[PDB]
Amino acid sequence: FVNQHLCGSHLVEALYLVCGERGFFYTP
Amino acid sequence: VNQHLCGSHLVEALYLVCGERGFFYTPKA
Amino acid sequence: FVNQHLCGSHLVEALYLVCGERGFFYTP
Amino acid sequence: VNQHLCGSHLVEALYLVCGERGFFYTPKA
Amino acid sequence: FVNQHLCGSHLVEALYLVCGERGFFYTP
Amino acid sequence: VNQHLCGSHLVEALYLVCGERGFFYTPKA
Amino acid sequence: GIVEQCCASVCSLYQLENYCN
Amino acid sequence: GIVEQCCASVCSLYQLENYCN
Amino acid sequence: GIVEQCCASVCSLYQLENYCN
Amino acid sequence: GIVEQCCASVCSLYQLENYCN
Amino acid sequence: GIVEQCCASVCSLYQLENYCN
Amino acid sequence: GIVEQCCASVCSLYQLENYCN
Ligand SMILES: [Zn+2]
């Protein structure tokens, strides 16, 4: 995959895409 | 202010509400 | 709620989330 | 260039078209 | 239309909106 | 990691995966 | 309106020009 | 949970406050 | 404006409820 | 193609690698 | 390119119709 | 963190698999 620079909901739009059904903990 | 939210739309809709505070998605709950 | 820095469609993606069915006037 | 647009997808699709000009969403019309 | 400054998936969210069913070649 | 992706959601989901490499959308295939 | 045009039905962009201040 | 509340059903924002660390 | 202030600075999800209808 | 794989059906990411120039 | 010019600068929704198929 | 590093810098789509559940 490529090393992508995510900020804002972009980050969460990625986290979603990866894990999806499992979940994820977003904590800045 | 009472919509259907499913998928990204939801976890985007979390980011604004809580944001820095943090939040968590866990469909299996 | 938290004080969030929106620019671009992000702003409108927020305006949508809030009002939704009522509407909104976007005028920059 | 003739798609179904419902929700954010729409009001995002306005932002590009009109933008600075301004636009308005008013489902109840 | 208006002259819009797109970077990131925004660009592709635009390319999509325009062409859609035809396709598009994204090549940076 | 096995979701339904249709529309923008898809061609956004390409951008992250491939990105600079480039990619292509061609529904008619 | 905008929805009927573009959601239930569909529309071009010249049909979105239409709701721009 | 979050989905049942907001997807199948719907919810306010005060109902999204709820899943914030 | 609050169409700018949000971008220049920050703004609440109350500040944005006003422009609703 | 991409849709059948991922829309009607579903796919992994290794299945999206596949449409990358 | 117009894959950059848009980001560096600005671009129309005609400029982007070209890369379509 | 990797909640920041991605924004400061870059990060993989493996780096982000960790925070999953
Ligand atoms: Zn969507």
Swiss-Prot record, chains A, C, E:
Source organism: Bos taurus
Highest taxon listed in the record's lineage: Eukaryota
Span of the entire protein shown here: 25 to 52 of 105
Protein name: Insulin B chain
